[PDB]
């Protein structure tokens, strides 16, 4: 079972690094893939890649050994690197939703409105926010709880538990997850509404001669919307729910579950290439890249 658990960490890292390296490669190497949307996808893949190379491996050891082997500084840094990459990943998912919403519903306004220079600013902003919520508060000790038992883990270099004050766990969870989630729900809901509202106008046109039904394309778009919101929420909702719960009633949820829900979130980083890089141009580039 703990033999199975260690095997399961190995494939997680393998999938994350493989997938995300393959995406960045595809985009960087293929002129056809260097679009505006794929700029945001590139930001996402960078974030998830750093999760697989650094965040998850240092994580995997802390489960196996049951203690932090690299001293208090690298604990602090690894914690900051984790928070940064997760925040950048999820906030970038939120920007991709907005991007595709404009491109699908208001494509002509979008082309003049969203430039490559504007997208860079959006991307730079996302990472600057990730940095300021992770590195700034964690290195400067703002994330620290006053509690004596928490303060025992800060003094022990073998302890690298994630223990925060109230303010930080609320604020970081809102900024990394809840605001992005709300924006993703609102945005992708307007796509559904826009599509349903357009089918309504087609039926008004036909002078009571035809009523539209869901075709192949409408079922597929709705499945896609399902996978987008489903996998993102399944993966990160449990952990971020529990993360706020801990700040109030600390005993209620065990530590083995909390960490296991955080591992589920890292799984999303392996899922993202599969979801957001299915384009026929991506499918060609991937074959071309694998000989």
């Amino acid at each position, epitope marked *: 079972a703990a033999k199975v658990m260690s095997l399961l960490m190995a494939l997680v890292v393998l999938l994350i690094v493989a997938g995300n390296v393959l995406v960045i490669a595809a985009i960087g190497s293929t002129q056809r893939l260097q679009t505006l949307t794929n700029l945001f996808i590139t930001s996402l893949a960078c974030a998830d890649l750093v999760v697989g190379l650094l965040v998850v491996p240092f994580g995997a050891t802390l489960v196996v050994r049951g203690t932090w082997l690299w001293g208090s500084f690298l604990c602090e840094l690894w914690t900051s690197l984790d928070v940064l990459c997760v925040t950048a990943s999820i906030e970038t998912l939120c920007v991709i939703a907005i991007d595709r919403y404009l491109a699908i519903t208001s*494509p*002509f306004r979008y082309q003049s409105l969203m430039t490559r220079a504007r997208a860079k600013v959006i991307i730079c902003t996302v990472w600057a926010i990730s940095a300021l919520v992770s590195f700034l508060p964690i290195m400067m000790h703002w994330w620290r709880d006053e509690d004596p038992q928490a303060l025992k883990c800060y003094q022990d270099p073998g302890c690298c538990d994630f223990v925060t004050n109230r303010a930080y766990a609320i604020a970081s969870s809102i900024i990394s997850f809840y605001i992005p989630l709300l924006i993703m729900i609102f945005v992708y809901l307007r796509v559904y509404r826009e599509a349903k509202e357009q089918i309504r106008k*087609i039926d008004r046109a036909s002078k009571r001669k035809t009523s539209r039904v869901m075709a192949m*394309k*409408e079922h597929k778009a709705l499945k896609t919307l399902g996978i987008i919101m489903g996998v993102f929420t399944l993966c990160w909702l449990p952990f971020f729910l529990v993360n706020i719960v801990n700040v109030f009633n600390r005993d209620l949820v065990p530590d083995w579950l909390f960490v296991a829900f955080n591992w589920l979130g890292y799984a999303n980083s392996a899922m993202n290439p599969i979801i957001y890089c299915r*384009s*026929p141009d991506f499918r060609k580039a991937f074959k071309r890249l694998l000989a």
Partner: nanobody, 120 residues
Framework: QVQLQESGGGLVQAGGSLRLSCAAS????????MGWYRQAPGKQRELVAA???????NYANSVKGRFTISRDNAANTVYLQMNSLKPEDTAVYYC??????????????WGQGTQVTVSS
């Protein structure tokens, strides 16, 4: 299978008018762009005009004030009403459909093309 059937092209005297018409038979997502592109001999393909499912439009500068794109409210059919034609407009005109059904990316359909020749 999606197919695009082009009609309305041909020979016409300069100063005259044509009305292209592309009827898309197949499964298309409600959100989409139907458009006309053209390729003059020894030139690259260029956008003539395009109309989104919503109703917003986009026209090239050369055809502004002359050409008008509109779509059948019921069927997947898009019309380009070309007036004040000039010999410069002579090209193979292609019908294009951008399907947004995958959300993250757009799938493209192209017509075989229809010839339009304007003599002086």
């Amino acid at each position: 299978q999606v197919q695009l059937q082009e009609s309305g092209g041909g020979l016409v005297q300069a100063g005259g008018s044509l009305r292209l018409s592309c009827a898309a038979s197949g499964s298309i997502f409600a959100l989409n762009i139907m458009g006309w592109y053209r390729q003059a001999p020894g030139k690259q393909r260029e956008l003539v005009a395009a109309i989104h499912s919503g109703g917003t439009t986009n026209y090239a500068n050369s055809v502004k004030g002359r050409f008008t794109i509109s779509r059948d409210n019921a069927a997947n059919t898009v019309y380009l009403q070309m007036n004040s034609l000039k010999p410069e407009d002579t090209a193979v005109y292609y019908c294009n459909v951008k399907d947004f059904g995958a959300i993250i990316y757009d799938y493209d359909y192209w017509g075989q093309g229809t010839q339009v020749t304007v003599s002086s």
